[PDB]
Amino acid sequence: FRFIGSNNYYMHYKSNRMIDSVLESARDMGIKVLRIWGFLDGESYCRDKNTYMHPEPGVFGVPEGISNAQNGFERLDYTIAKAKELGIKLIIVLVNNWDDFGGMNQYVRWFGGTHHDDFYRDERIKEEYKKYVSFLINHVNVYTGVPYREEPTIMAWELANELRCETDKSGNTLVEWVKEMSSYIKSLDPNHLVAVGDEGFFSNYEGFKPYGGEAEWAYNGWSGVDWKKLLSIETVDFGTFHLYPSHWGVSPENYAQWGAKWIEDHIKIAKEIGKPVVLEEYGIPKSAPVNRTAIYRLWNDLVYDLGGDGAMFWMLAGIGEGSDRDERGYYPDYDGFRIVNDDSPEAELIREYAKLF
Numbered sequence: 001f002r003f004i005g006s007n008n009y010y011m012h013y014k015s016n017r018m019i020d021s022v023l024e025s026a027r028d029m030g031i032k033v034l035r036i037w038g039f040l041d042g043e044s045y046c047r048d049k050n051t052y053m054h055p056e057p058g059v060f061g062v063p064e065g066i067s068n069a070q071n072g073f074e075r076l077d078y079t080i081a082k083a084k085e086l087g088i089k090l091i092i093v094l095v096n097n098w099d100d101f102g103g104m105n106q107y108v109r110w111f112g113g114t115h116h117d118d119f120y121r122d123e124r125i126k127e128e129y130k131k132y133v134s135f136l137i138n139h140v141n142v143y144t145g146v147p148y149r150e151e152p153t154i155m156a157w158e159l160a161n162e163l164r165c166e167t168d169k170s171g172n173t174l175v176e177w178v179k180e181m182s183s184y185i186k187s188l189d190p191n192h193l194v195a196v197g198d199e200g201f202f203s204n205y206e207g208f209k210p211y212g213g214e215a216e217w218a219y220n221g222w223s224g225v226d227w228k229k230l231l232s233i234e235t236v237d238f239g240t241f242h243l244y245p246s247h248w249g250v251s252p253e254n255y256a257q258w259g260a261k262w263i264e265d266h267i268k269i270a271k272e273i274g275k276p277v278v279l280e281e282y283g284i285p286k287s288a289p290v291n292r293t294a295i296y297r298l299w300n301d302l303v304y305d306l307g308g309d310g311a312m313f314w315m316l317a318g319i320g321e322g323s324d325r326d327e328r329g330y331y332p333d334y335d336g337f338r339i340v341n342d343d344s345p346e347a348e349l350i351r352e353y354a355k356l357f
């Protein structure tokens with residue numbers, strides 16, 4: 001099982017019409033796997049989308065006596081049931097490194113900590129993460145009757161989107177947290193694959209340097225991530241990395257080769273450890289002074305030729321509504337990375353590659 005996949009973050013709070021549009025586009029495009037958020041942390045973030053998953057510690061779903069709100073579990077239920085019908089598999093990520101939808105900083109605010117990375121260290125925070133995740137994994141989907149623990153449409157759980165720990169550049173804080181949490185999940189759910197969901201940063205490995213001396217911090221452990229050590233954890237089933245040369249300090253004329261070397265390095269490392277590896281997010285901004293489709297063709301060829309297990313672009317959207325609808329009626333391209341099922345050369349390329357993988 002090798003695949004072309006994609007990402008979509010609003011599958012747990014948007015309407016049936018918009019959810020169906022993404023998943024029908026993924027099917028029509030040949031996209032076999034969609035990576036989605038399974039979190040919505042903090043009262044303000046839940047209120048902002050009028051959708052509740054984890055507004056306060058120990059409150060899962062909609063607070064008692066909040067009426068007329070969406071329950072993010074029922075939205076995720078609908079998405080899971082529609083993906084099951086349409087034959088799409090799902091990777092569901094359990095917390096965000098970043099503050100969108102609350103993230104680790106929302107947990108730190110609930111428990112009165114003083115740094116983002118207190119998330120990995122404070123036992124009261126870790127306890128609350130475990131409670132949330134246990135609630136989610138045991139949740140019974142209202143459309144299928146099958147608990148998530150038992151639902152084959154779900155391909156994998158991911159611990160944390162783009163996790164970083166800048167306060168411990170030895171890498172040890174994250175190794176310990178990932179061992180703890182991946183084992184915990186295996187304990188709740190013996191059926192599903194577990195991955196980290198991080199960007200794939202290295203921590204000064206002999207023989208691995210960045211292309212063109214740019215974005216060195218991604219190779220030298222600045223973020224506190226030691227990907228190789230994380231992939232060696234017995235309770236992690238496959239490696240994940242992401243790729244955004246434009247965000248990371250790479251010059252445009254080097255996007256394609258920096259990404260090529262990043263991909264080669266990660267597949268080589270994962271092959272030697274002996275686990276599957278997914279390039280699970282990549283994107284080039286639509287305004288970059290380079291040919292984006294040709295960069296995407298290059299990266300997908302590489303993952304295909306080197307035996308990588310999947311390549312997932314950030315991100316796929318469908319039809320929009322309300323205050324999220326652009327000049328063509330789609331969910332807007334807010335970040336410059338959106339791809340939709342249209343006649344763009346990027347959408348054509350995805351359709352072409354989805355036939356190869």
Ligand SMILES: OC[C@H]1O[C@H](O[C@H]2[C@H](O)[C@@H](O)[C@@H](O)O[C@@H]2CO)[C@H](O)[C@@H](O)[C@@H]1O
Pocket residue numbers: 016020
């Ligand atoms: O009563 C049948 C059915 O109606 C609605 O289902 C929609 C579905 O949400 C769409 O994705 C598509 O499959 O067409 C259906 C309408 O024919 C409700 O959402 C559903 O609860 C209900 O069973």
Ligand SMILES: OC[C@H]1O[C@H](O[C@H]2[C@H](O)[C@@H](O)[C@@H](O)O[C@@H]2CO)[C@H](O)[C@@H](O)[C@@H]1O
Pocket residue numbers: 098099100162244247248
């Ligand atoms: O700070 C919130 C900001 O962070 C995230 O963007 C990351 C990005 O995913 C990485 O590629 C990284 O190098 O830069 C950013 C953080 O500095 C969210 O993805 C984004 O929506 C959000 O604005």
Ligand SMILES: OC[C@H]1O[C@H](O[C@H]2[C@H](O)[C@@H](O)[C@@H](O)O[C@@H]2CO)[C@H](O)[C@@H](O)[C@@H]1O
Pocket residue numbers: 009100323324334335
């Ligand atoms: O969540 C990642 C996503 O968040 C932000 O997008 C907002 C958008 O700006 C709003 O107008 C609103 O309707 O919802 C979106 C998600 O909360 C960043 O603007 C966007 O770049 C990013 O991908």
